[PDB]
Structure 1
Amino acid sequence: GNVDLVFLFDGSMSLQPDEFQKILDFMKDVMKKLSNTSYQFAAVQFSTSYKTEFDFSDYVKWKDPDALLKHVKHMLLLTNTFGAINYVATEVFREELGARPDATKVLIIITDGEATDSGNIDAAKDIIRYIIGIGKHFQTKESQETLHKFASKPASEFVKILDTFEKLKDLFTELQKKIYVI
């Protein structure tokens, strides 16, 4: 019933300042809409390295997406997606950061490029993983397909590709049509 949800977001060099900002604003739009629910949130920037920008405890105490993300600094480096996802699994989904042990775990990966590292995500198997790939880096079917190994199956359900960063506005509109009292 409880959902612990991590936004794992790309801070690579390829992102223009306004593109990075549109990611930030997308995350806030989502959290604001799901205020006062069974959702609790944390946000991790990844590039070459990984940074938990805020954790579940931070979210619980303040409940203010704007404040929680105010101090994000765009890393401007690589796109170490394998390491990032592994970092979330082992270093973010923990009591110490406010995670609830029995909650349903959800990861929302937002990226504008293919991974710069390699390996596996065995450690993240218990997490429901969604991945949003954005921009001209994902023009080809082959580039979209590379994202599939990161997300839960089927890709048709757990993978979304967006032509541009403006389409995050549109995805948020669509998302809200999937909100129900169950």
Structure 2
Amino acid sequence: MNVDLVFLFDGSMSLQPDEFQKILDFMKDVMKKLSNTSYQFAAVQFSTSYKTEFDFSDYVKWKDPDALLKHVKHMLLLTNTFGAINYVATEVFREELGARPDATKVLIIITDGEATDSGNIDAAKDIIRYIIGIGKHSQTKESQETLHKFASKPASEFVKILDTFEKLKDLFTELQKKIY
């Protein structure tokens, strides 16, 4: 079973620049440790607005995750997570942009959930979304609830705090489910 997985990563100002680097180094760690065909990737940075940093088409082509994210600029403006998800749903998972139609679609959201917009993610229901919480600002009633709002259900199975990447044994042996 093929899997289309998209990294939606928080490049808002609320994350330190060293924290941002940690998020890049994280995505690279995941892609490196999944260089089999089954997983096809794509990454979009969100802040005030959204930009896809690479397509599935691009991963399928270049295939070098180091040189694929090598040109990211930390956006450093508001945190518009809600419309960010909607963007991934409608603008990244596409026939034209290299998405496999049969593939079961996954989303990894990395943010502090201090989100600066509101809405609904109905457009991305069928996308199974693990969300992972980094940031000094993810420590509040609101932020936490916001994180769980983005997650698949039941919430406390798709939400974790980034650590110094301990999930690279945890999440991974659960991401080895999807390949079948």
TM-score computed with the length of structure 1 as normaliser: 0.87
- Over 3 Å counting, the alpha-carbon distance change for 1:29 and 1:87 in structure 2 is same
Deviation at 1:112, TM superposition (A): 2.2
After superposition, the C-alpha distances for 1:14-60 in whole angstroms (9 at most, x for unaligned) are 22221111100100010011002300000000000000000101001
Deviation at 1:144, TM superposition (A): 1.5
Counting aligned pairs with the same residue, the percent is 99
Cα distance in 2, alignment partners of residues 8 and 144 from structure 1: 18
Kept in 1: contact 2:3–2:178 (CA 8 A): no
Q: How many residues align?
A: 179
Unaligned 5+ runs, structure 2: none
Cα distance in 1, alignment partners of residues 167 and 101 from structure 2: 34
Deviation at 1:176, TM superposition (A): 8.6
Kept in 2: contact 1:107–1:129 (CA 8 A): yes
Is 1:106 matched up with 2:111?
A: no
- Over 3 Å counting, the alpha-carbon distance change for 1:49 and 1:165 in structure 2 is farther
Deviation at 1:155, TM superposition (A): 1.3
Deviation at 1:160, TM superposition (A): 1.0
Cα distance in 2, alignment partners of residues 137 and 165 from structure 1: 19
Kept in 2: contact 1:135–1:165 (CA 8 A): no
After superposition, the C-alpha distances for 1:96-134 in whole angstroms (9 at most, x for unaligned) are 110011100000000024210011011101100111111
- Over 3 Å counting, the alpha-carbon distance change for 1:164 and 1:142 in structure 2 is farther
Alignment-derived partner of residue 55 in structure 1: 55
Deviation at 1:141, TM superposition (A): 5.0
- Over 3 Å counting, the alpha-carbon distance change for 1:124 and 1:174 in structure 2 is closer
After superposition, the C-alpha distances for 1:80-104 in whole angstroms (9 at most, x for unaligned) are 0110000000000001110011100
Report the more deviating stretch, 118-127 or 141-150. Answer: 141-150
- Over 3 Å counting, the alpha-carbon distance change for 1:98 and 1:127 in structure 2 is same
Kept in 1: contact 2:113–2:146 (CA 8 A): no
Unaligned 5+ runs, structure 1: none
Kept in 1: contact 2:111–2:134 (CA 8 A): yes
TM-score computed with the length of structure 2 as normaliser: 0.88
- Calculate the aligned-residue CA RMSD, in Å: 2.7
